[PDB]
Every structure is written in structure tokens, then in C-alpha cells.
Chains A and B, each alone.
With several copies, the nearest count.
Chain A
Amino acid sequence: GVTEEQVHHIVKQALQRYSEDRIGLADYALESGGASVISTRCSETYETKTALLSLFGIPLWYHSQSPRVILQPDVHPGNCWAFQGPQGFAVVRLSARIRPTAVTLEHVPKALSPNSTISSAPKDFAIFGFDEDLQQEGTLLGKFTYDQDGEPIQTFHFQAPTMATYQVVELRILTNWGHPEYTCIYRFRVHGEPAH
């Protein structure tokens, strides 16, 4: 079979990959690395008016996650950005101009969900690139489907990316997994080739 040394090697390398943001690819949409949401170019946030923050017994305001959370690595149930219905979009100014080669979308696992369902997850989606920051018409980079029966983190590689570069990318959600009120986005990542 396998030697003990081979087992240690397999385990070490699997934990290395796990530690590298799970997938081992630089994320040009990570906010701490220099990416940001373009607030006016995102869907309206679905607000429930339920999470009330108070201080000294004084009600202050209701807390809802803004689109910024999709560019942050804190994926736990409820740490997601929600928009109303099954169609929505977010636009991100990447940390650098890149040739985009892949995107990653993740959702919470079924095992951490009541009744093992994730109907608020995005389903069909499309990625668009915008040449400059204030331009109206994007270029389609690819169309993909987040599989509710797949792994929580799903990476999608473009079949044949052109040589075009972009610093502005749109995540366009076309359908969801059936939730009748909203769609929840946990984390979106963009991968590719920077200047060198």
C-alpha cells in the first residue's frame, strides 16, 4: 500500500492547501488586499429590520450586512449580503488590473443549515468585465451555475480568457435555489494574471 512517510506527506500538503484560503489562488476581490464594492452599482440591500442594536437600553439601529461582506473571509451563517428576489448584482473594483482567469463563489454548507437546505444560494450567474471604472457596457467573461449539491466553495475557470484586462468586474445573479424572498451571497473571489 502506502508508507507512513507517504501518509504524512499527503496530510501535510492537504493542510497546506487548506491554509492557503482553501484554494491556493490570489483573490483580487479581497477587500483587505485593496478591492472595494462600487456601492451605487450594486442591488439594493434586502433589509429585514430585525437585528436591533442597543446601548444602555437605548435602541440605536438595525444591523444588516452591506455588499462589503462578500469581499471578506468570515463565512458563517448569516454573514452574507442579501438582495430581494432571485436576480441581483454586485460590482467590484478589483485591487489590481488583471486578465481574469477564474472566479470563486461560496455558500454555507447544508450540514450547518436547518433542514439541510440552502435555497437562498445563488444558482445561475454571469461575470462581466468593464474596461474602465465609469463605463456602461460590460463584456461577458462567462456564465456558470453554483451547484447546491456541490462543495461549499466552488471555483469556475473561464474556458479561454482573452488578453483583455479589467479592474472592474460584475457578479450578476440570474437565478437562485428557490428561496421565495431573497438571495444570500457569502463570498465572491476573482482570480487572474496581474501585470509583472
Chain B
Amino acid sequence: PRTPYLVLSYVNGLPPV
């Protein structure tokens, strides 16, 4: 089937760093 791609978007600001 179609080549899947997991997309990652930041929708609520920074992750913990």
C-alpha cells in the first residue's frame, strides 16, 4: 500500500527540555 509517514507537529508549545 501507500508509503506511510508518521507526522509530528507541536500544537501546544515546547516539550520539556
Contacts and interface: CB of A to CB of B under 8 A. Distances in A.
B6 A55 contact: yes
A45 B2 CA distance: 13
Contacts, number: 84
Contact of B4 (A61, A80, A113): A61
Given A61-B1, A62-B3, A64-B3, A33 B17 contact: yes
Contacts of A45: 5
Contacts of B6: 53-55, 66
Interface of B: 1-17
The binding surface of chain B is classed by DSSP as: loop
Question: What size tier do the contact residues of chain A reach?
Answer: 35 or more
Contacts of A108: 17
Contacts of B12: 48-50
Interface string A71-113: 0000001101010000000000101100000000000100001
